[PDB]
């Protein structure tokens, strides 16, 4: 749902998931990179009581 | 070196400016871990400002 | 007597150099723009392919922070055929947000848009400046403000605020990382006016300590001793001839330099042309006008209707003077310039005047109004 949840997902997990090809993963990485973010980050004590 | 009479045998007294300089990558890692900084440059700026 | 300095910078050293043995020179490391960029690349959660693409991308960044090859070059340089171009674009987008923001941009419009993408949405004149940069960035370069106003459909004040916001950005983001220190030059021959005429003298910064090690071998160095003397003699003679022939350049600046060549000095000093070409290269003289390389005084010429010759540097200076005082409402075309220099006796062409204008980096007539 949130950017915080997506950012923690790694590239391999989002490659193995069904209905998500290489183009969609690349577009996700592109829209993340537009804001200086990347997949594979790690966060502690998430979510903060949404 | 000065003297500290209140210390225990396993303890020393370290200035916090020296500690801030010596433990810098640990501070970067802990800052990025808990969401305060999203990138390395943000943590660099935060440590520079001494927030 | 040689002039004694009435002021100076006190020497940095404040020690007594007591130790009689000091180690050999090793040097230090420096952090350039690319070192900082790679340091940021390593600490980023990339992949193996992403890190290779980032390495190839950072290899192509220049001193100003602008990408110097098209993305197709990088994709070819990767060397793997499964990789498409969108992955390269994504890695480039991620790199462009490293410190300083806007680095590794394709062109100015891209860099300005990247910098504007980082400001918070509550900045007042954000959409207007974004539209100006994205759509019409050359109308701003022409300082038009009316056709741009006719297209952007905006009033005066909004346009002024948007222009002020645009001009507050950084066009060269990569110059922030200053690894360089301004280096200088040491003049070798100094020219000063004595008895109303200009005379030259060697700089006394060299090492004239003529010594030998008679304690113990020095026969070979005895030849180098007089080799240095020969070098000093030839440099002094060539510089003296150059200054004697150019007595009017120093007095009145440019527009009076004579059209001399290597052969003239070779005949004057009785040496081969090659020796003159070797001495007068990467050697400088200091005058109350500035520091000039000895090669600066050799120039071409054009025919003068009066029967003489006019140096090309004089014609360049005249072109500069004429253009600097042209009509602000309607500037001067090179056809006008060739006419004005024609009446003075300077018989030059028109394309030659255009070449001179290009070398001086002066925009054409239409761009000077």
Q: What does this molecule look like?
A:
The structure is cut from a larger assembly and holds chains A (50 residues), B (51 residues) and C (369 residues). Chain A has helices at residues 3-8, 11-16, 22-33. With 50 residues, chain A is mostly helical. The longest helix of chain A is centred in the middle third of the chain and has 12 residues, at 22-33. In chain B, 4% of the residues are buried. The longest helix of chain B is centred in the middle third of the chain and has 10 residues, at 24-33. In chain B, 53% of the residues lie in helices and 0% in strands. With 369 residues, chain C is α+β, with helices and mostly antiparallel strands. Chain C has helices spanning 33-42, 48-59, 71-78, 85-95, 108-116, 126-135, 138-141, 147-152, 156-166, 219-245, 247-252, 262-269, 273-279, 312-324, 334-343, 351-359, and strands at residues 189-194, 197-202, 284-287, 290-293, 301-303, 309-311. In chain C, the strands form 2 sheets. Chain C has a 4-stranded mixed sheet. A two-stranded antiparallel sheet of chain C has the order 5-6. Chain C is extended and about 75 Å long. Chain B: It comes from Escherichia coli (strain K12). Chain B: This is DNA-directed RNA polymerase subunit beta'. Chain B: DNA-dependent RNA polymerase (RNAP) catalyzes the transcription of DNA into RNA using the four ribonucleoside triphosphates as substrates.
């Amino acid at each position: 749902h949130y950017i915080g949840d997506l950012v923690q997902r790694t590239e391999v997990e989002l490659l193995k998931t069904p209905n998500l090809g290489k183009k969609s993963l690349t577009e996700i990485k592109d829209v993340l990179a537009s804001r200086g973010l990347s997949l594979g980050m790690r966060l502690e004590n998430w979510p903060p009581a949404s | 070196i000065t003297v500290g009479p209140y210390l225990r045998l396993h303890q020393c007294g370290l200035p916090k400016k020296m500690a801030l300089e010596l433990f810098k990558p640990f501070i970067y890692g802990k800052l990025e871990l808990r969401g305060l900084a999203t990138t390395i440059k943000a943590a660099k700026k935060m440590v520079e400002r001494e927030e | 007597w040689d002039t004694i300095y009435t002021a100076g910078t006190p020497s940095g050293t404040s020690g007594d150099y007591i130790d009689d043995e000091l180690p050999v020179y090793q040097g230090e490391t420096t952090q350039t723009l690319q070192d900082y960029l790679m340091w940021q690349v390593e600490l980023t959660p990339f992949s193996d392919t992403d890190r290779a693409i980032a390495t190839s991308i950072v290899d192509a960044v220049d001193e100003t922070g602008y990408l110097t090859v098209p993305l197709e070059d990088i994709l070819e340089s990767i060397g793997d055929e499964e990789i498409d171009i969108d992955e390269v674009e994504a890695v480039l987008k991620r790199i462009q947000r490293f410190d300083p923001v806007g680095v590794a941009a394709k062109d100015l419009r891209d860099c300005l848009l990247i910098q504007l993408s980082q400001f918070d949405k509550t900045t007042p004149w954000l959409e207007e400046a974004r539209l100006i940069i994205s759509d019409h960035l050359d109308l701003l370069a022409n300082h038009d403000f009316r056709t741009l106003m006719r297209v952007t459909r905006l009033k005066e004040d909004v346009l002024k605020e948007a222009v002020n916001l645009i001009q507050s950005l950084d066009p060269r983001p990569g110059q922030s990382i200053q690894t360089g220190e301004p280096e200088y030059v040491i003049p070798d021959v100094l020219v000063r006016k004595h008895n109303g005429h200009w005379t030259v003298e060697l700089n006394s910064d060299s090492i004239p300590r003529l010594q030998i090690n008679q304690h113990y071998n020095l026969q070979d160095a005895k030849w180098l001793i007089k080799s240095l003397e020969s070098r000093n003699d030839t440099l002094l003679r060539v510089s003296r001839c150059i200054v004697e022939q150019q007595q009017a350049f120093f007095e009145q600046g440019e527009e009076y330099m004579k059209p001399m060549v290597l052969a003239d000095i070779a005949q004057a000093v009785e040496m081969h042309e090659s020796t003159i070409s070797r001495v007068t290269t990467q050697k400088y003289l200091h005058s109350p006008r500035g520091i000039f390389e000895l090669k600066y005084f050799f120039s071409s010429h054009v025919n003068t209707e009066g029967g003489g010759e006019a140096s090309s540097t004089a014609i360049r200076a005249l072109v500069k003077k004429l253009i600097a005082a042209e009509n602000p409402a309607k500037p001067l075309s090179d056809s006008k310039l060739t006419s004005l220099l024609s009446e003075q006796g300077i018989m030059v062409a028109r394309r030659t005047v255009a070449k001179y204008r290009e070398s001086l980096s002066i925009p054409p007539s239409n761009q000077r109004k």
